[PDB]
C-alpha cells in the first residue's frame, strides 16, 4: 500500500491529480498487453488498475466484457496474469499496481493464499467488485495481513455510515463512483460529488480517485477541480485496443496520445 502513499505525496507536492488507466491483463494477448501497459506508463500513467479476466464480470459493460473475452480467446488464465504482474513489477519498481478482481477468483483457492500471491508479485491494492463493505471482513483482513491496500467503493448513494466505514477500512485510495450502472465510456456521470469528497477528507479516508464513465481530459480536470486526488479511465482506453486490433503499431500510438492528454489534464 505504501506505493500509493508515496505517489499521492509526490502528486500533492506537484499540485497534481493522478491519472490511472484500466486495462484487462492479457487483452488482446499476453505480449501485446505487456507492451500496452509499458506504453500507458511511458505516456504518463501515475498508477495502473489491471483486470484479471473473469467469466462473468457483472460490474462491467460491453466494452470491458469484450476485453475479458479477447483475453480468454488468447487462453489467458489468472496464473498467467500473475506471471505478467511479476514482469511488470520487475520493469517498474515504483508504480502503484491495483487489481480489479471478482470475488470468485479471490475465494477460489483460499482468500489468504490469494493475497499472499499478490504480495509475492508486488501488487499494491485489490478491489473486489462484487464484495460490498458488508461482506468485506475476510477480504480486507487478508489484504492488510499481506500489506495490500483493500479498495472500497464510495457510491453516489452513500450514507454517513458508509462514508465512515470506507474511510476507516480502506487504504491506498478510495474509489469514488461517478454514477450508478456498469463500466462504460458512453454513460457519463450526472451528479456533483463535492459533498462526498469533502466528507471522505473529514474522516481521513484514503485519497479519492473518481471512476466510471471518465473518457475525456475535461472530466479528469473536473474530478481534480472538485477535490478528488485523480481519476480512473477504463472503457475509453480499452476502446482504443478494440478499434486497432489489426494494427498493434497504431494501437500503441493512439494509446500514447490519449493517456498523455488525459495525464496533462490532471496537472
Amino acid at each position: 500500500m505504501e506505493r500509493y502513499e508515496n505517489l499521492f505525496a509526490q502528486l500533492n507536492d506537484r499540485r497534481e491529480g493522478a491519472f490511472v488507466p484500466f486495462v484487462t491483463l492479457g487483452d488482446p494477448g499476453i505480449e501485446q498487453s505487456l507492451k500496452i501497459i509499458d506504453t500507458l506508463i511511458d505516456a504518463g500513467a501515475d498508477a495502473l488498475e489491471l483486470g484479471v479476466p473473469f467469466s462473468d464480470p457483472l460490474a462491467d459493460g460491453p466494452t470491458i466484457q469484450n476485453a475479458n473475452l479477447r483475453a480468454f480467446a488468447a487462453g489467458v488464465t489468472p496464473a498467467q496474469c500473475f506471471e505478467m504482474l511479476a514482469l511488470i513489477r520487475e520493469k517498474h519498481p515504483t508504480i502503484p499496481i491495483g487489481l480489479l478482481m471478482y470475488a470468485n477468483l479471490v475465494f477460489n483457492n483460499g482468500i489468504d493464499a490469494f493475497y499472499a500471491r499478490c504480495e509475492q508479485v508486488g501488487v499494491d491494492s485489490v478491489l473486489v467488485a462484487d464484495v460490498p463493505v458488508e461482506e468485506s471482513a475476510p477480504f480486507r483482513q487478508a489484504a492488510l495481513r499481506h500489506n495490500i491496500a483493500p479498495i472500497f467503493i464510495c457510491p453516489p448513494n452513500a450514507d454517513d455510515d458508509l462514508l465512515r466505514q470506507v474511510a476507516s477500512y480502506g487504504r491506498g485510495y478510495t474509489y469514488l463512483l461517478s454514477r450508478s450502472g456498469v463500466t462504460g465510456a458512453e454513460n457519463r456521470g450526472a451528479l456533483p460529488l463535492h459533498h462526498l469528497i469533502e466528507k471522505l477528507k473529514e474522516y481521513h479516508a484514503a485519497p479519492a480517485l473518481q471512476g466510471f464513465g471518465i473518457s475525456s481530459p475535461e472530466q479528469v480536470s473536473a474530478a481534480v477541480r472538485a477535490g478528488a486526488a485523480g481519476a480512473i479511465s477504463g472503457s475509453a482506453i480499452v476502446k482504443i485496443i478494440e478499434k486497432n486490433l489489426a494494427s498493434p503499431k497504431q494501437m500503441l500510438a493512439e494509446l500514447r496520445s490519449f493517456v498523455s492528454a488525459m495525464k496533462a489534464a490532471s496537472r
Partner: protein
C-alpha cells in the same frame, strides 16, 4: 447491517457491487414491513385465490403406479394462472414493487414461465416490464415469448455466453445496477443476493402448506417424501418449507443431469460443483479449477443454470434434504409417460421430478411409499421442442 439473517450456514450473503446495497436493504425492509401488514397480506391472498386460482389441486396418479406399492400425488402448480408455480411469488414481489413506489420491472427468464408470470402481473398491476431471455431459450421456449409479447412486455434476447438463463441473469443484474431507483428486479428463483432466497421461499410456501393439508385430508398422515426439481430452487423450497420441521418427511431435490454428469454437460452444482461466489451469493457453482464460472446444460431451459439457491446448499449440508440428478433422456421418458397415461402435459423441468419419483417406485416396487411430486408447470412451452426430438427418434 440487515434486518434478517442473509446466510443459511455458510451459504448466501449479499455479493453485489456496493451500488446495489441500498436497493437490497430497501427491498428487505419493504418485505419485513409487508409481512406484518394485514392489508398487504389480504391483497396478496385475494390475487392468489381469485386471480391465480389457488388452492391448486392435488391429483392422485391412477395408472403410472399400477403394480407397485407407491402411491403418487401430483401438486398441480401446472393449473395456476400462467401455467407454473412462478406466478405465486411474482404476485407478492409485484405488490412489493408497488409498495416501494417502483414503476418498472426487470426480470430474467429461462423457461419463459417466470417471464410470462412477470408480464401478466405487470399488466394487471400497472408496471412496465422488461424481460431478459437467452437467445437459445427464445427459440426452444418460443410459445412463452409470444405470450410475453402479447401481454405488452419487452423481451430482450441475450446472445452473450451460453445464450441461456445464466446469461439472462447477468444482463438483468447489470441493468438493475443502473436503474434501481425506478425499476424493481423481480428475480424468479430462490437464489441471488439476500433478501431474494428468503422472500421467494416465503412467497412460495403455500405450495407445501396446501400439500400438507391435502395429504392429511386424503391419507390421514404426512407423505414419506416430497420431490421437486431444482433450478435456482423456488418450486422445491416452496414445497419443502412447511415440511422442514416434520423430520419423518423426506425432502428430495432433483438437479438436471443433462447429457450425463460424467459429460460435464449438466446443471447439478449442488452435488457435482464446488462452493463459490457468483450472482450475488456464496453457493455451489459449476466452475473451472481456477474459479471461472462454467456454462451449464439441460434439455430444460428452466433448470439450465450453473448454481443453486443457498438454502438448498444448507439443507443438503446438514443432511435434512437429499439431492439427486435426472438426465435429459430420463426426463423425456417421464414427460411421455405422464402425457400418455395420466393425460397431463408437464413442463420438462417438472418432468425431472416425476422421473425420479418413477425411479423410486420402479427400483423398489414392493416398498410402501406415499410420495408427492411438485408438478411445477405445464408443458405447452415444450411441445414443439419435444415433438421435434421424438420425431427425430419415433
Amino acid at each position: 447491517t440487515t434486518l434478517l439473517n442473509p446466510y443459511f450456514g455458510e451459504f448466501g450473503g449479499m455479493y453485489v457491487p456496493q451500488i446495489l446495497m441500498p436497493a437490497l436493504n430497501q427491498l428487505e425492509e419493504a418485505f419485513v414491513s409487508a409481512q406484518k401488514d394485514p392489508e398487504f397480506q389480504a391483497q396478496f391472498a385475494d390475487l392468489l385465490k381469485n386471480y391465480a386460482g389457488r388452492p391448486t389441486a392435488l391429483t392422485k396418479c391412477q395408472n403410472i403406479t399400477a403394480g407397485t406399492r407407491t402411491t403418487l400425488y401430483l401438486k398441480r402448480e401446472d393449473l395456476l394462472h400462467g401455467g407454473a408455480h412462478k406466478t405465486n411469488q411474482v404476485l407478492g414481489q409485484a405488490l412489493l414493487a408497488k409498495r416501494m413506489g417502483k414503476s418498472e420491472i426487470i426480470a430474467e427468464t429461462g423457461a419463459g414461465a417466470h417471464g410470462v408470470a412477470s408480464a401478466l402481473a405487470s399488466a394487471l398491476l400497472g408496471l412496465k416490464c422488461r424481460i431478459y431471455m437467452g437467445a437459445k431459450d427464445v427459440e426452444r421456449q418460443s410459445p412463452n415469448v409470444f405470450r410475453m409479447r402479447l401481454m405488452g412486455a419487452e423481451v430482450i434476447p441475450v446472445h452473450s455466453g451460453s445464450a441461456t438463463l445464466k446469461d439472462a441473469c447477468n444482463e438483468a443484474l447489470r441493468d438493475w445496477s443502473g436503474s434501481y431507483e425506478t425499476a424493481h428486479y423481480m428475480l424468479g428463483t430462490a437464489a441471488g443476493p439476500h433478501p431474494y432466497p428468503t422472500i421467494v421461499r416465503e412467497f412460495q410456501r403455500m405450495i407445501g402448506e396446501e400439500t400438507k393439508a391435502q395429504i392429511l385430508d386424503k391419507e390421514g398422515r404426512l407423505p414419506d417424501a416430497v420431490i421437486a426439481c431444482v433450478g435456482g430452487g423456488s418450486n422445491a423450497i416452496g414445497m419443502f418449507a412447511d415440511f422442514i420441521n416434520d423430520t419423518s418427511v423426506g425432502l428430495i431435490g432433483v438437479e438436471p443431469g443433462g447429457h450425463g454428469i460424467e459429460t460435464g454437460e449438466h446443471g447439478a452444482p449442488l452435488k457435482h460443483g464446488r462452493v463459490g461466489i457468483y450472482f450475488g451469493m456464496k453457493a455451489p457453482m459449476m466452475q473451472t479449477a481456477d474459479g471461472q464460472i462454467e456454462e451449464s446444460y439441460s434439455i430444460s431451459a428452466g433448470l439450465d443454470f450453473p448454481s443453486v439457491g443457498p438454502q438448498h446448499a444448507y439443507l443438503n449440508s446438514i443432511g435434512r434434504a437429499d439431492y439427486v440428478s435426472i438426465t435429459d433422456d430420463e426426463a423425456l421418458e417421464a414427460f411421455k409417460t405422464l402425457c400418455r397415461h395420466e393425460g397431463i402435459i408437464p413442463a420438462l423441468e417438472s418432468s425431472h421430478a416425476l422421473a425420479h419419483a418413477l425411479k423410486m417406485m420402479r427400483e423398489q416396487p414392493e416398498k410402501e411409499q406415499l410420495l408427492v411430486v411438485n408438478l411445477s408447470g405445464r408443458g405447452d412451452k415444450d411441445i414443439f421442442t419435444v415433438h421435434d426430438i421424438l420425431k427425430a427418434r419415433e
